[PDB]
Ligand binder design. Structure first.
Ligand SMILES: CCCCCCCCCCCCCCCCCC(=O)OC[C@H](COP(=O)(O)OCCN)OC(=O)CCCCCCCCCCCCCCCCC
Ligand SMILES: CCCCCCCCCCCCCCCCCC(=O)OC[C@H](COP(=O)(O)OCCN)OC(=O)CCCCCCCCCCCCCCCCC
Ligand SMILES: CCCCCCCCCCCCCCCCCC(=O)OC[C@H](COP(=O)(O)OCCN)OC(=O)CCCCCCCCCCCCCCCCC
Ligand SMILES: CCCCCCCCCCCCCCCCCC(=O)OC[C@H](COP(=O)(O)OCCN)OC(=O)CCCCCCCCCCCCCCCCC
Ligand SMILES: CCCCCCCCCCC1=C(C)C(=O)C(OC)=C(OC)C1=O
Ligand SMILES: CCCCCCCCCCCCCCCCCCCC
Ligand SMILES: CCCCCCCCCCCCCCCCCCCC
Ligand code: SF4
Lengths: 213, 162, 129, 60, 322, 150
């Protein structure tokens, strides 16, 4: 129930993303597994976002940064302006055609480990802007870990996607050292939130009438 | 106390030699910083604590403006190192090398011909240096202030762009 | 005595353990964690677009005059460092010498301020009107 | 610069420091997501559903 | 090795090691406390989920930093690039190595003292200079030039601010300085020295409002943008050790250090040092960042004559009562 | 009843920010006046081209159902004319110029925005200054880039 990705920019592959993904089993060792759990906990409980913004979704993201929401409680407030110091790219805005090379460059300039959260309908699929100058989804050329529907998603939805990213990180397998062991990245094939919440979503019967407040 | 003095002297000699025979200006400044740190260590081993203190205090700022001017003009990539490399040739440095060697051996002959009793290494605090500076040596301080003022006036007059 | 060699050993161990700890965490940072591979990984960061030229151009700092004044003022500072530790034994006459020294220092500073030096900001950035 | 400007600036920095200290002595304004549920208005436009009639059949 | 002298040497070495580990741990926990205190200042909480009260956030940060990849760019000068975080980490540590935290608890009882602190500050500027130049980036070069201009601004009066304290104590030793404040603390006679040293010490660590080399709004994080992994963590930890060092030095120089009426001396020293640490955070949260040309003009035209006049008045007062 | 703040003749960063503070205070005054006096009437017009029609009449009348059906599917048919509206936006003056061909879609939609003009003004007002002045100028212009590029 895992997927393995190995990347190779210099290999024979012209289209982005320059990676290969297969479906494998969990490789996980009486102490290596515990140390992998400890580093996964340390990575998931300390995620530093990239100060990269495209459009209105970034405004709601920095609304989440402020005091009335306090995403700092999750340890995700540091907001580095450099790609090298950042661990998470939140594509929060429209993936414009003129900025897709810029987004690809900034994704290349981040360092391992890296995670991608697409925020909003523009970043997910292009959204309302099925237009000549908009890339229909940032996942056309970068691998996206978490998707957030919304236009804009409210800040608590951004923290919900951050918690989903933390749950994804906390059970993935990565190379502990770059000199010993396999260098491929193992990510879990988790159950989707739609089928998980279908039990509690279908059973909804009555809501408050729109004339109230 | 001998070990620190001799190790710092050897480090100063090596860093000075690497300074005078280097093409990279920033690396030369770094080795100059190392050499002056070693000089201050030599000062500290001889009991002149104030001398080493001023060697690190006032030359860290002196080499800092040297770094500022190196960034201002000299850094150009590999072109400046390549241009500096052509000026240094085996004949070019082998010319004055024998002159420096014969001067050094003459000065060494002069040094070895004097009597010795050994440096006791008794520390000299900055209080005694301050007492002597503002006591018997008044006019040295005042005309050194005038000398530094003169150098400042010269620096202002020359260093203006327009 | 014993306290002096004990303090020297404590200072040496402080230096050694500090440098060794810095080296140890540098080695641990370098050895732990997998590497990343990208086509534009080894490119200087310039907000996502390729540079014009390089970052090794010569850059005209406007405060170089202030720098070569700073060296002189640092030497005046070292003279006052030497004076200030022995004020009581210097007497009132030494206070007169230091007063003359400091008066020459402010005379040079007022001269530097008034003649246009120590002012390298552009005309558009002088906050006029 | 003028000495009065320097004194006014020093007092201004002191006043700003004092006000941020009184902000430290104030009440927190954070809504504790996800520990407390987010209050949403009845006509808030979020997840889309298809509803039923009171008879129990789908209204579409 | 059974001798009172050798076990005394071992005890002094152990005390120095304890001081070093405590100040490094205090720098990392001071990063965590900066996050929590900025939350407190800005009507929020900060990290309070990783363990009880967020106490394990620093551990997760350390694990992430150690397992984030440490890289050296191909376009950078590798030796200087690796050297600069080491200097940034170690210079203010060696500056702290002279601070007396308690009677009988000091690493180095130097006769130079504040001179050694001046040496370590003049060596600490070179870390930021080397990081800015070596990374071969344009924002880094601009940040290095801004840091050099900042050093031009502050280092002229950094020592003359404390020369009043040196004149009052009559010596360069920190033990003599804290012993000279047995009757009154040095903040009251040397108040202009106090504020000028506060300005210069905030400028030493490149802390706000004096964060010109790494101004995120201006230079997009400035000189250390190419740094990542444990080199970036080395820069931040060295900055926080610098905060602790400057706070402890100001406590010893202007507030008596460990001297207090009722509490144990280390309790008073820790209370005043934590007070000035939270004042560092209060200064960062409170006031905006000035332009660096204005900073240079303020440091040259205002602070330097103020320190000179303060030294002259201090000498006149000392010789009047002698 | 609200006031329009004006400057002294110099458009500084500080002057623009303080003018926006006074605009915020005047907007608070407008909000107080409209809170104290809000009419009790309809929230939609009685015109046949009001899109969409009121919901309860749509749910229980066939004329309203027909109008709603043809207005949400094909769109309202606005006759062939040119229209223009200029308003004071949050960042300046926002204008819509709409050319209708007599169909249910706009033949031409021209949007004039102030941030375009401000960003074009940027080189003429910051040339010769430092980069810090440019940072303050960027922070004190009140622009977003969806406003500029549209
Ligand atoms: C390579 C790394 C650096 C190696 C050179 C520097 C360290 C050498 C080893 C020093 C060990 C301690 C020692 O020998 O101390 C002797 C002396 C102690 O001081 P003092 O009071 O004069 O001695 C009489 C004691 N009753 O010490 C002294 O008087 C001064 C000791 C030397 C000065 C301090 C260290 C200078 C470091 C320069 C680094 C340069 C760049 C590398
Ligand atoms: C590597 C370094 C290993 C240790 C080197 C020796 C440290 C001890 C030392 O230098 O002691 C000498 C002096 C203290 O002597 P003091 O107590 O003042 O005098 C005796 C009282 N009559 O102390 C001093 O002179 C201290 C000042 C020099 C210390 C230099 C440390 C390195 C600085 C550059 C780092 C880059
Ligand atoms: C343990 C160590 C840490 C201790 C923590 C507590 C103390 C921290 C001290 C922090 C000091 C920060 C100082 C910042 C100085 C900035 C000066 C500057 O650049 O001001 C520029 C600004 C405009 O420049 P101007 O000259 O007017 O324009 C010329 C253009 N044609 O001009 C002005 O704004 C004019 C007014 C300048 C005011 C300068 C600062 C006054 C002193 C510092 C603030 C108060 C600190 C606390 C003092 C004690 C309070 C109880
Ligand atoms: C503890 C001691 C604190 C002393 C300062 C208290 C300041 C109190 C305050 O709120 O000052 C703000 C005020 C700002 O002035 P302004 O913007 O014109 O507003 C008018 C209405 N306040 O500020 C003022 O009006 C300035 C008046 C106070 C000046 C105090 C000067 C103290 C002595 C000099 C110290 C700094 C020297 C720097 C060199
Ligand atoms: C191995 C040690 C790693 C320490 C990591 C510390 C990270 C920085 C925490 C403090 C901080 C700083 C300096 C900071 O620059 C910043 O940006 C404004 C913050 O708020 C988002 C911070 O909380
Ligand atoms: C383009 C001009 C270059 C000028 C270079 C000058 C180099 C001078 C080197 C002198 C070396 C002297 C070595 C010893 C000679 C014998 C002793 C002195 C003369 C009696
Ligand atoms: C926030 C406080 C930061 C303090 C930094 C320096 C601490 C150095 C370690 C001191 C450890 C020893 C303390 C004194 C022991 C003797 C007295 C015990 C009773 C108080
Ligand atoms: S999804 Fe909506 S809110 Fe987000 S960038 Fe697109 S238009 Fe803006």
């Amino acid at each position: 129930d895992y997927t393995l990705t190995r990347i190779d920019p210099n290999g024979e592959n012209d289209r982005y993303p320059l990676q290969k993904q297969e479906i494998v089993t969990d490789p996980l060792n009486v102490f290596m597994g515990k140390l992998n759990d400890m580093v996964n906990w340390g990575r998931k409980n300390s995620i530093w976002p990239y100060n990269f913004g495209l459009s209105c979704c970034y405004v709601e993201m920095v609304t989440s940064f402020t005091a009335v929401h306090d995403v700092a409680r999750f340890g995700a407030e540091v907001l580095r302006a450099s790609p090298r110091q950042a661990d998470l790219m939140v594509v929060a805005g429209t993936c414009f055609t003129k900025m897709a090379p810029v987004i690809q460059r900034l994704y290349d300039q981040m360092l391992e480990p890296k995670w991608v959260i697409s925020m909003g309908a523009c970043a997910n699929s292009g959204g309302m802007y099925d237009i000549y100058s908009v890339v229909q989804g940032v996942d056309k050329f970068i691998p996206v870990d978490v998707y957030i529907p919304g236009c804009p998603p409210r800040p608590e939805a951004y923290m919900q996607a951050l918690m989903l990213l933390q749950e994804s990180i906390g059970k993935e397998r990565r190379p502990l050292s770059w000199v010993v062991g396999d260098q491929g990245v193992y990510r879990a094939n988790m159950q989707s939130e739609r089928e998980r919440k279908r039990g509690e979503r279908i059973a909804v019967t009555n809501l408050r009438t729109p004339d109230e407040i | 106390m001998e070990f620190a003095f001799y190790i710092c002297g050897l480090i100063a000699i090596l860093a000075t030699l690497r300074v005078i025979t280097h093409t990279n200006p920033v690396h030369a400044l770094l080795y100059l910083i190392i050499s002056l740190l070693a000089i201050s260590g030599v000062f500290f081993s001889l009991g002149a604590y104030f001398a080493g203190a001023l060697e690190i205090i006032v030359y860290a700022g002196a080499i800092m403006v040297l770094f500022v001017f190196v960034v201002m003009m000299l850094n150009l990539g590999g072109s400046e190192i390549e241009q500096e490399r052509q000026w240094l040739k085996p004949q070019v440095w082998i010319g004055p090398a024998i002159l420096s060697a014969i001067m050094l051996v003459v000065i060494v002959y002069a040094i070895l011909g004097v009597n010795d009793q050994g440096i006791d290494g008794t520390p000299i605090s900055a209080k005694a240096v301050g007492i002597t500076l503002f006591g018997p040596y008044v006019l040295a301080v005042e005309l050194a202030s005038m000398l530094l003022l003169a150098g400042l006036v010269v620096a202002f007059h020359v260093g203006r762009e327009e | 005595s014993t306290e002096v060699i004990a303090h020297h050993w404590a200072f040496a161990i402080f230096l050694i353990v500090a440098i060794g700890l810095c080296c140890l965490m540098l080695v641990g940072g370098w050895f732990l964690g997998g590497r990343a591979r990208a086509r534009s990984k080894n490119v200087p960061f310039e907000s996502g677009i390729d540079s014009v030229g390089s970052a090794r151009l010569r850059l005209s700092a406007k405060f170089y005059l202030v720098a070569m004044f700073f060296v002189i003022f640092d030497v005046e500072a070292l003279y006052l460092f030497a004076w200030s530790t022995s004020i009581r034994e210097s007497g009132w006459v030494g206070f007169v010498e230091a007063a003359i020294f400091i008066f020459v220092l402010l005379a040079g500073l007022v001269y530097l301020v008034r003649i246009g030096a120590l002012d390298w900001t552009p005309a558009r950035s002088r906050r006029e009107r | 610069m003028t000495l009065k400007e320097l004194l006014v600036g020093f007092g201004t920095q002191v006043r700003s420091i004092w006000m941020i200290g009184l902000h430290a002595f104030a009440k927190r304004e954070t809504r504790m997501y996800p520990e407390e549920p987010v209050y949403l208005p009845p006509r808030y436009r979020g997840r889309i559903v298809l509803t039923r009639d009171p008879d129990g059949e789908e209204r579409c | 090795w059974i001798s009172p002298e050798l076990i005394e040497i071992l005890l002094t070495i152990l005390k120095a090691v304890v001081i070093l580990l405590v100040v490094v741990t205090c720098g990392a926990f001071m990063s965590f406390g900066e996050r929590r205190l900025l939350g407190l200042f800005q009507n929020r909480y900060g990290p309070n989920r990783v363990g009880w009260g967020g106490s394990l956030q620093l551990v997760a940060d350390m694990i992430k930093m150690f397992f984030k990849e440490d890289w050296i760019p191909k376009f950078s000068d590798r030796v200087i690039f690796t050297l600069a975080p080491m200097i940034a980490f170690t210079s203010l540590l060696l500056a702290f190595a002279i601070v007396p935290v308690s009677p009988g608890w000091v690493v180095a009882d130097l006769n130079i003292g504040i001179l050694f602190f001046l040496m370590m500050a003049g060596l600490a500027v070179y870390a930021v200079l080397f990081a800015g130049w070596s990374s071969n980036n344009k924002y880094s070069l601009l940040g290095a030039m801004r840091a050099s201009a900042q050093t031009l601004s502050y280092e002229v009066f950094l020592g003359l601010s404390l020369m009043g304290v040196v004149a009052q104590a009559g010596s360069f030793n920190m033990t003599d300085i804290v012993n000279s404040q047995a009757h009154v603390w040095n903040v009251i006679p040397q108040f202009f020295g106090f504020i000028t040293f506060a300005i210069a010490g905030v400028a030493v660590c490149h802390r706000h409002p004096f964060d010109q080399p790494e101004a995120e709004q201006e230079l997009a994080d400035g000189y250390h943008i190419e740094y990542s992994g444990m080199k970036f963590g080395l820069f931040f930890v060295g900055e926080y050790i610098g905060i602790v060092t400057i706070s402890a030095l100001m406590v010893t120089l202007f507030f008596g250090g460990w001297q207090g009426p009722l509490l144990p001396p280390f309790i008073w020293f820790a209370l005043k040092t934590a007070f000035f640490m939270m004042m560092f955070i209060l200064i960062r949260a409170s006031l905006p960042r000035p332009r660096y040309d204005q900073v240079m003009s303020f440091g040259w035209k205002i602070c330097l004559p103020l320190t000179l006049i303060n030294l002259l008045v201090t000498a006149a007062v000392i010789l009047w009562q002698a | 009843d609200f006031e329009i703040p004006v400057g002294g003749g110099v458009s500084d960063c500080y002057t623009r920010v303080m003018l926006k503070v006074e605009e915020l205070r005047q907007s608070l005054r407008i909000l107080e006046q409209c809170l104290n006096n809000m009419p009790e009437g309809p929230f939609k017009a009685d015109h046949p081209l009001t899109t969409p029609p009121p919901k309860e009449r749509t749910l229980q009348h066939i004329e309203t159902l027909i109008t709603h059906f043809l207005q949400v599917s094909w769109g309202p048919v606005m006759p062939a004319n040119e229209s223009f509206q200029m308003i004071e936006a949050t960042k300046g003056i926002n204008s819509y110029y709409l050319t209708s061909d007599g169909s249910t879609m706009s033949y031409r939609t021209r949007i004039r925005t102030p941030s375009y003009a401000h960003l074009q003004q940027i080189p003429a007002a910051i040339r010769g200054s430092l980069v810090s002045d440019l940072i303050v100028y960027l922070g004190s212009i009140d622009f977003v880039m969806s406003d500029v590029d549209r």
